[PDB]
């Protein structure tokens, strides 16, 4: 039930925009793009990766332990 012209109050803010036909869709796509993804990765790796390596270690150990347990030796 929310409409433009009724959302909120904003004062003293200028927005400059260009037409889509004046500008490139892929402005500096690799030159600026790659540096950004690396920066985004660095920012989040310590938050995202360590639970999944913790999954990976419990996976690797668990599969190994199950394999070894269904072998005998001195009996």
């Amino acid at each position: 039930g929310r409409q433009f012209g009724h959302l909120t109050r904003v004062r003293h803010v200028i927005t400059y925009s260009l037409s889509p036909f004046e500008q490139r869709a892929f402005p500096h796509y690799f030159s600026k793009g790659i540096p950004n993804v690396l920066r985004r990765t660095r920012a989040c790796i310590l938050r995202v990766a360590p639970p999944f390596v913790a999954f990976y270690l419990v996976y690797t150990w668990g599969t190994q332990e199950f394999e070894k347990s269904k072998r005998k030796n001195p009996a």
């Binding site: 109050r9 904003v10 004062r11 003293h12 803010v13 200028i14 927005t15 400059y16 925009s17 260009l18 037409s19 036909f21 004046e22």
Partner: protein, 89 residues
């Protein structure tokens, strides 16, 4: 010095027009023009005199958002042709 440089470069005889309308003969308008304007570009026709160059129109938006003002102003335009063009009519 900025101001006199502007005056020197721009207020030059081939670039200005003495216009009149009303109860006058053209002859006396011409007479007064030689009387009072003739010391302007008799040998002052010199320096880079002064080409305009085309202006690139864009296609773009400027939005000064001020909700403290009680009415919105909006102006919208496509690129027109210059003074010369028959398309104006």
């Amino acid at each position: 010095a900025d101001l006199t440089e502007y005056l020197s470069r721009h207020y030059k005889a081939p670039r200005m027009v003495l216009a009149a309308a009303g109860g006058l003969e053209h002859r006396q308008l011409l007479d007064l023009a030689q009387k009072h304007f003739s010391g302007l570009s008799g040998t002052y026709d010199e320096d880079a005199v002064p080409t305009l160059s085309p202006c690139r129109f864009t296609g773009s938006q400027i939005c000064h958002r001020e909700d403290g003002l009680p009415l919105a102003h909006v102006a919208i335009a496509v690129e027109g042709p210059g003074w010369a063009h028959p398309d104006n009519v």
